[PDB]
Amino acid sequence: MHSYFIFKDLVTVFLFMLILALFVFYSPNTLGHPDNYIPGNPLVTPASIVPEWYL
Amino acid sequence: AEVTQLSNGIVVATEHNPSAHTASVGVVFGSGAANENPYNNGVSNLWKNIFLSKENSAVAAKEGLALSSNISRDFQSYIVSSLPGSTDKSLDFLNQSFIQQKANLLSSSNFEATKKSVLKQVQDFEENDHPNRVLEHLHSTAFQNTPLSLPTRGTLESLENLVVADLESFANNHFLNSNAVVVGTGNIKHEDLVNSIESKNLSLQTGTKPVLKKKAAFLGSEVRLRDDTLPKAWISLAVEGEPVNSPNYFVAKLAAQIFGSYNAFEPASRLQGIKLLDNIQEYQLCDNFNHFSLSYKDSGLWGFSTATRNVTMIDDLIHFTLKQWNRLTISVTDTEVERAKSLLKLQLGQLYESGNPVNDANLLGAEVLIKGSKLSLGEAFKKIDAITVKDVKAWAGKRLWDQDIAIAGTGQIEGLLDYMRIRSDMSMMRW
């Protein structure tokens, strides 16, 4: 594992850190729903109760 | 004391040792198994077995002679040892059966019989001689595609395609006048040998040997001929050492003598002054190893050849001996280099001075063919005792710290890891 696959993993770790740094720094809220920033009021229903995208 | 005199043609080199009995006169050429193509390779070993054939050896032993020959990686030799009164007889035999006509040697009888014999003994060397064949595979993977990569015995795939035309062309191309030294050792004086050389006109050819285009350049590589039906795991690795007539030659032999040889079964060899034997004797990591230092005409190797029955802890053995190699560059002390100086003086005095007058003849021929005049043993001992610890530290920084190594192995060497861990082992992060 040591001198080869650690460096293969390092290549894809830096690629994932690049994509994650892009999605964190330049467009953070393009993954979440734009209704979690309204404070939770149990009298108003937001007309579609979609969860986060992977569920 | 070992005089050398150049005639109009040949050069004669002798050492009169008047205590030994059997005087020995032969001729040594300076083009061994690194002066041929990969397609006519194995013609030097074939020449050795032409000269040592049954008919030639019978018409030598009827006179009271005894033939011996040796093929190495830069010189080939043809020695006729004999009684001390019988030396002009031996020189006349070497004239009449090697220098002039060789038609009684190169028959359709002698050549076919000796080619069958050479093919048999070469395939037996390939099948059932494991440390020498991985040393030759280390030579074939270190200097690959440059003409120091040829096996000195030849191989069967380049030996079944040889007829007498290739042997005659090799005789015309490398058995020259500017390629030979006529050696003498035993109790011949120098004037007797050179007078018997001057009486009968003894000269081979006139021209020069062909220079060849590729220099022997080291290439750090790896080969593994794994045979998982063998009991042991022979594996040899080596770096580019010093060539002969290089100033760091005795420093390379001394650094090889620091780690020396070892054999796990003799009780007087498990108690040596090597630091490695306190690492490789808790789980019996190896059964024997020896640190050679070969030096050919163009380049040379430097490394160890081991054999292992503990086929799962091969990487621990390689790891411990390469850490001990890095100890030469960082932290080699003075008591180990004094121990190695005394042991190297012992080893060179054993090698240069034995009762055998054929090893003495081959050594004199090789070092007169390369340098021009063989140095003494007192001056060699002075060159040994003039070595410091900063000199071997500078040589270890030049040739052992993070250099490229060449590895050859056989047997069950799956427990050996890949290359880049062994190459990353040649230089550590300072502990």
Rounded CA separation B252/B268 (Å): 26
Contacts of B418 in chain A (CB under 8 A): 3-4
User: Which two tokens mark B129?
Assistant: 């001689």
Size of interface A-B (CB pairs under 8 A): 7
In the 8-state DSSP scheme, what is residue B426? Answer: G
The experimental method behind these coordinates is cryo-EM
Instruction: Identify whether the C-beta of residue B107 lies closer than 8 Å to the C-beta of residue B163.
Output: no
- The Cα–Cα gap between B48 and B33 comes to 12
State the resolution, in angstroms. 3.3
How far from each other are the two terminal CA atoms of chain B, in whole angstroms?
49
**Torsion of Cα atoms, B70 then B6 then B243 then B79, to 10°:** 10
Q: Which residue has the tokens 């019988």?
A: B86
Gap between the Cα atoms of B407 and B101, Å rounded: 45
Query: Tokens 């034997």 belong to which residue?
Result: B277
In DSSP terms, B238 is beta-bridged to B303, B406
**Cβ-proximal residues to B199 (8 Å cutoff; 6+ apart), any chain:** none
Q: Which residues on chain A place their C-beta less than 8 Å from a C-beta of chain B?
A: 2-4
Helix (H, G, I), strand (E, B) or coil at A16: helix
Phi–psi pair at B261, nearest 5 degrees: -110, 170
Residues in chain B, overall count? 431
Question: At B76, is the secondary structure helix, strand, or coil?
Answer: strand
Amino acid letter, B32: G
User: Could you tell me if B418 lies within 8 Å of chain A, comparing CB atoms?
Assistant: yes
Nearest residue on chain A to B418, judged by CA atoms? A3
Q: B43 exposed, middle or buried (CB, 10 Å; 0-12, 13-18, 19+)?
A: buried
Within this chain, domains B1-202 and B208-431 share the same CATH topology: yes
Q: Is there a contact between B405 and B237 (Cβ–Cβ < 8 Å)? A: yes
Sort out which chain B residues have CB atoms less than 8 A from A3's CB and list them. 418, 420-421, 424
Token pair, residue B42, equals: 């194995």
Chain B residues with CB-CB distance to A4 below 8 A:
418, 420
Distance, CA of B22 to CA of B361 (rounded, Å): 12
Half-sphere exposure at residue B40, Cβ-oriented, CA atoms within 13 angstroms: 18
Cα–Cα distance list, B276 to B164, B229, B265 (Å)? 51, 29, 16
Residues in chain A: 55
Coil, helix or strand for B261?
A: strand
Round to whole Å and give the CA distance between B266 and B277. 13
Strand ranges of the sheet holding B235-241, from the earlier edge strand across to the other edge: B222-226, B406-411, B235-241, B300-307, B288-292, B261-263
Q: Which residues pair with B13 in a beta bridge?
A: B4, B183
Residues in chain A with CB shorter than 8 Å from the CB of B424 are 3
> Would you tell me the crossing angle of helices B110-127 and B43-51 to the nearest 10 degrees?
120
- Tracing tokens 């809220």 back to the chain, one arrives at A29
Do strands B288-292 and B65-71 pair parallel, antiparallel, or not at all (unpaired)?
unpaired
Alpha-helical regions (H) of B5-109: 43-51, 54-61, 88-94
Percentage helix, strand, coil, to 5, in chain B? 40, 15, 45
What residue type is B369 in one-letter code? L
- Phi and psi of B419, rounded to 5°? -75, -45
Residue by residue, DSSP assigns B118-137 as: HHHHHHHHHHS-HHHHHHHH
Return the closest-CA partner of residue B326 out of B275, B278, B262, B375.
Answer: B275
In the CATH scheme, what is the code of domain B208-431?
3.30.830.10
What is the number of other CB atoms lying within 10 angstroms of the CB of residue B401?
16
Could you please report the per-residue DSSP string of B328-394? HHH---SHHHHHHHHHHHHHHHHHHS-S-TTHHHHHHHHHHHHTSS---SHHHHHHHHT--HHHHHH
Distance (Å, whole) CA B4 – CA B145: 36
Q: Calculate ∠ Cα B23-B27-B31, nearest 5°.
A: 145
CA-based nearest residue to B51, from B92, B22, B91, B79: B79
**Taking Cα atoms as reference points, which of B64, B55, B68 lies closest to residue B26?**
B68
- Cα angle B387, B393, B399 (rounded to 5 degrees) comes to 110
- Whether the CB-CB separation of B117 and B49 falls below 8 Å is answered with yes
- DSSP letter for each residue of B195-255: HHHHHTT----SS-PPP-S--------EEEEE-TTSSS--EEEEEEEPPTT-TTHHHHHHH
Burial of A20 (0-12, 13-18, 19+ CB in 10 A): exposed
Q: Which residues contact B184 (CB under 8 A, 6 or more apart)?
A: B12, B13, B14, B15, B23, B24, B25, B190, B193, B361
Q: Is B315 on the interface with A (CB under 8 A)?
A: no
The residue extents of the domains of chain B are 1-202, 208-431
Residue B260, CB half-sphere, CA atoms under 13 Å: how many? 24
For strands B288-292 and B300-307, give the pairing: antiparallel
CB-based burial label for B55 (10 Å; 0-12, 13-18, 19+):
middle
- CA B134 → CA B138, B149, B269, distances in Å? 6, 13, 24
DSSP per residue over B236-247, as a string?
A: EEEEEEPPTT-T
3-state helix, strand, coil in chain A (%, to 5): 45, 0, 55
HEC sequence for B134-159: HHHHHHHHHCCCCCCCCCCCCCHHHC
Domain B1-202, architecture per CATH: 2-Layer Sandwich (3.30)
Chain B closest-CA separation from residue A39 CA (Å): 56
Q: How far apart are CA B12 and CA B381, in angstroms?
A: 25
User: Testing the interface with B: which of A1, A2, A5 to mutate, by most B Cβ within 10 A?
Assistant: A2
Is residue B300 within 8 Å of residue B313, measured between CB atoms?
Answer: no
Residue B109, CA distances (Å) to B50, B166, B418 in order = 11, 17, 50
